[PDB]
Chain A
Amino acid sequence: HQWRSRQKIGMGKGSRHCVICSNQKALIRKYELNVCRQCFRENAENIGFVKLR
């Protein structure tokens, strides 16, 4: 009843989480990625993103 309440609503910044590390700060939402920027740079090669220019 009162244990979660606000979290059970599921709205706003505090309801997203990072897919890899569960953090809620600086998430990438483009193309429905939901990976934080720090973790994206480490895994970008495996995702299929390469730096050409």
Chain B
Amino acid sequence: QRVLVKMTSRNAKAVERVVAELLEHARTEKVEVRGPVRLPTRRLRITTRKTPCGNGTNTWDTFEMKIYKRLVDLRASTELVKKITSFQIEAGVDVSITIP
């Protein structure tokens, strides 16, 4: 659990792209990498009446929003790890680096 990098976004394709090419950036140094972990996907739901004036049949409207989370474990020296993590980041994807 030496180095924890967590990525999360709103686009499954973008999240997968970042993880896959982060691994090749890791695979070019010979770090010890624990495989990516897919955390459970979370959906935020909001239900709202469609009408703006309260008339007619009571018809509703359900909106959703999905969030994908991935986890990667790296065991390497700090000045090295910053070099791996210096890659370009796709728009909409955030990356958090933590050490426990």
* A and B in direct contact, judged by CB atoms within 8 A: yes
Q: Which residues of A lie under 8 Å from residue B61 when comparing CB positions? A: 41, 51
Distance in Å from the Cβ of B86 to the closest Cβ of chain A? Answer: 28
Within 8 Å of chain A (Cβ to Cβ): is B79?
A: no
Instruction: Offer 13 A-B interface pairs, CB within 8 angstroms, sorted by A.
Output: A28-B48, A30-B46, A31-B44, A38-B52, A40-B48, A41-B61, A48-B10, A48-B65, A49-B46, A49-B63, A50-B64, A52-B64, A53-B64
Total number of residue pairs linking A and B with CB closer than 8 Å:
31
Give the contacting residue for B62; candidates A38, A48, A53; CB below 8 A.
A53
Number of interface residues of A (CB under 8 A): 15
Scan A22-41; emit 1 where CB is below 8 A from any B CB, else 0: 00000010110000011011
Using a CB–CB cutoff of 8 Å, the interface residues on chain A facing chain B are 28, 30-31, 37-38, 40-41, 44, 47-53
User: Within the assembled complex, what's the spacing in Å between the Cα atoms of A50 and B63?
Assistant: 5
Contacts A50-B63, A50-B64, A51-B61 given; does A28 touch B10 at CB 8 Å: no
